C-alpha cells in the first residue's frame, strides 16, 4: 500500500481491459488479507485507493458483466461515515439510470442483456446478504417496485429473509425506519409504487424473523398511524384520494403484522404499550389503543356506498385489509366467550350497514374448469359401503380473506346440539337463501369446503344449502363440476349422520 | 410506433421523481425535437407539443418545468409550418347494540 503510484498505466483510459480486472483482483486479495483497516479516517493510502475503487465502476468503458466483479467487494466500504458516501451513491445511481432495463424486464429473455442483468443483480444481493447496509436496500427497492413481479421476485424474498435475522438489533431498526420513511414522505408518485414497499419489503422483514420482542418499531409507529387513520376524506381529486387510501391501508397492514406475532403481555398488560400510547404511568388496564382502532375498524367495512362510484375497487382492498386487521386484533386480545359474532357479523341493515356486499366483487365470474384421486374415490366407496350396507389456490382461494377466516374458525373449534350463535347461523341464513347473490354463496361454499371438519357435527343443518347450490342452475359454465364434485364429496363422506331422506323438498332436490 | 414508445417512456420518466431523469427526459425531447424538425413531420411536432403542454398544465412537473423554462420547450417557432428562419420570439412571447361490547373489553 505504499507504491500504488507505480501502476497507473493499468487503471487508466486507453488501457487494455483486463489489467483493470487485475487491479480489482489485487484490491480484493489485499483487502481480505490483513484486516478491516483500509476503510476509515485515511489510515494508509486510503484516498489514493478510494479513487481507484470509484473510477473503476464509474467509468463508461467497462462492460456490465465486468463491473459485477467490482461490485462484489462492496462490504469493505459500506460501514464508513458521510462525505464520499454521496459520491458512492451518485456513481451507483448513475450506473442504474444508464445501464439497466427501463422500467421492469423490458427485454426478451435469453438475449445478451437479460444475462448481464441477472448477473449484476445477483451480485448486488450477494453483497446485501452479508453487508446489512441501510443504504443499498433503497438502491433496489425503487427499481423493483415500478411493477409487481420483477423476473426474480423469489430471489428478493429469499434475500430479505436472510437479512431480517442477523443479530445486532440496532441496525434492523434502521432498516425498518428507512423503509417506513421512504414510504411515509410526500414525494408524489403512483399508488402501486407507494403500496408495494409495505406490500413486499417491510412485510417480509417484520414477517420472517425480526425478534420476538422488537418493540422499537412498535414504539415509533403508535402515534404515527392513528393520526393518519382518524382523518377525513376530501373528495376533490383522485390523486390525493388514492394515496390517502394507500397510507391508511398500509398502516392497517403494518398494525396487522405487528399485532399478530406479539404476545398478550406486551400489547394488553399494564406495560409500556398502553403506557406508550398514553402519557407515562396511568391507571388504565390494557385497552387504550385497542378500542380506538377497533371503532374505526368497525366503521371501515360497515360503510354503505349508495352514491359513490369514483374509485371503489381500491376501497374493496381497503375494506378487506380492515377486516384482516379486525381478525388479527380480536385474535391477539382477550379471547372471551362470544365477541366475534357481534364484532364481525352483526350487520344491522336498516340504515344500510352490511358487510359482505362491499368486500366481495359481485362482478367477476369464477370459471371453475372440468378437471384438466381415484384412490380417494375408491376409499370413500369402501367406507361408505361399509357404513351404509394446505390448500390449493385456483381462483377462489386466493381472495385475501380465506386463510384468516379458516384460522379463526379453527380457533373457535379448539378454543371453547341446537346450533352455533351467528358465525354459523348467519351464514346458514345467507347460504340457504335463494336471494343472496351468487359470489357470497360461492364464498361461503368454499369456506365450508375448506372447513368441513368443523361443520361436521351440524350436517343435519348443513345438508340442504350445499345440495341446493349443486343442483340449482345458476352456477354458470356447463353447470360447473369443479365445485359440485367437492360438494358431493363432502356431503357423501359425512354420511352416517345427516339422514339424506326424510324431507320431501330434500327428496326432490336429490 | 417507436415514437409512441418513447412517448410512454418520457411520461413514466417524468412521473417518477429522480433528478437525473429530468435531464434524461430533456435529452429525449431534444432528440425528438431535431427528429421531428428534420424528418418533415411538423404536424406531429405541433400536435404532440400542444398535448404535452396540456399535460404539463394539468400535472405539476414542477422542477422539470423549471428546467424547461430555463431550457425552452414551446410550439413550432417559425410560421406554424416547416419552412422559415424565425428565432425564439414565439417561445419568449408564449413564455415570458354494538356500543355495549366496545367498553366490555
Give the gist of this structure:
This is part of a larger assembly, with chains A (510 residues) and B (105 residues). Chain A has helices spanning 17-33, 46-58, 64-71, 85-96, 114-130, 137-144, 153-164, 169-184, 191-207, 216-219, 222-229, 238-260, 265-268, 274-277, 290-301, 313-331, 340-344, 356-359, 374-388, 402-413, 425-431, 438-450, 464-471, 481-493, 504-509.
List the helices and strands and how they pair.
This is part of a larger assembly, with chains A (510 residues) and B (105 residues).
Chain A: H1 17-33, H2 46-58, H3 64-71, H4 85-96, H5 114-130, H6 137-144, H7 153-164, H8 169-184, H9 191-207, H10 216-219, H11 222-229, H12 238-260, H13 265-268, H14 274-277, H15 290-301, H16 313-331, H17 340-344, H18 356-359, H19 374-388, H20 402-413, H21 425-431, H22 438-450, H23 464-471, H24 481-493, H25 504-509
Chain B: H1 2-15, H2 19-38, H3 42-58, H4 62-69, H5 89-94
Helix pairs in contact in B: 1-2
How would you classify the helix and strand content of chain A by structural class? Answer: mainly alpha
The major pleated sheet of chain A works out as: none
Total helical elements of chain B: 5
Per DSSP E runs of 2 or more residues, the count of β-strands of chain B stands at 0
Order of helices and strands of chain B: HHHHH
What is the string of helix and strand elements of chain A?
HHHHHHHHHHHHHHHHHHHHHHHHH
Radius of gyration of chain A: 29 Å
Strand percentage of chain B lies at under 5%
CA gyration radius of chain B, whole angstroms: 21 Å
Q: Structural class given helices, strands, pairing of chain B?
A: mainly alpha
CA(first)-CA(last) distance of chain A: 89 Å
Question: Tally of extended strands of chain A?
Answer: 0
List the quaternary state of the chains. Answer: part of a larger assembly
Strand count, sense and barrel status of the largest sheet of chain B are:
none
PDB class: dna binding protein/dna
Keywords: DNA-dependent Protein Kinase, DNA repair, nhej, V(D)J recombination, DNA binding protein, DNA BINDING PROTEIN-DNA complex
Entry title: Cryo-EM structure of activated-form DNA-PK (complex VI)
Chain A: DNA-dependent protein kinase catalytic subunit
